[model samples]
Target: HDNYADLSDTELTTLLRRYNIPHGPVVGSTRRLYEKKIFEYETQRRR
Candidate 1:
């Protein structure tokens, strides 16, 4: 959470764009989990 908070809106927006994640409500546990996995991978590599 803190790591994400540290990102500027532009930085976050660029990341979302790079990953092709739509800015909308995601449905289902599986979809959420997939998003989480993507976040984890990106954050891990960023660190």
Candidate 2:
């Protein structure tokens, strides 16, 4: 998984909302942080 690196701003926001990952500006490190959080959340749920 590209850690959602290719996701656009809106796409990322939507995915985050689906997982209730909290909303943010998606600026600078914000997008990357959200991606990491989403990945972690998914991993935990899978196990």
Candidate 3:
């Protein structure tokens, strides 16, 4: 399992960009939801 709780905003954004993901919201109204999307993406790889 993955722990996005420890994932930092700056660090997450930096890593996510490597995957071509934008630094901000992409599919949700709230930043939390958008961060969830990023969390989910990370899950698949760590799994």
Candidate 4:
């Protein structure tokens, strides 16, 4: 896998945008669980 961890935030955002992925939280109380999953996936990917 590419070492995406070394990418700057702007670079990451560009990649995410290119892939059509959201980079931030959704509105409303129900968003926390989804946000947690997203964070966990990112953490796991970094390893």
Measure candidate 3: CA RMSD.
Answer: 4.6
lDDT of 2 by residue, 2-42 (tens): 74888888888898888877776997567678778888988
- For model 3, the superposed segments whose C-alpha errors exceed 4 Å read 25-31, 43-47
Better of 1 and 3 by lDDT: 3
Please provide, for model 3 over 1-47, each residue's C-alpha lDDT reduced to its tens digit, 9 standing for 90 to 100.
23544666566667678778766543324546656767778788899
- Preferred candidate (lDDT higher): 2 or 3: 2
| Native RMSD of candidate 2 (Å) | 1.9
Give the alpha-carbon lDDT of every model: 0.58, 0.80, 0.63, 0.53
TM-score against truth, every candidate? 0.48, 0.75, 0.48, 0.45
lDDT of candidate 4 over 1-47, digit per residue (tens)? 23554555556556556546665633335344444544566777799
Clashing pairs in 1: none
- Lowest-scoring 10 consecutive residues by lDDT in candidate 2? 22-31
Query: How many clashes in each structure?
Result: 0, 0, 0, 0
| Global local distance difference test of model 2 | 0.80
Residue 46 of model 4, lDDT score: 90
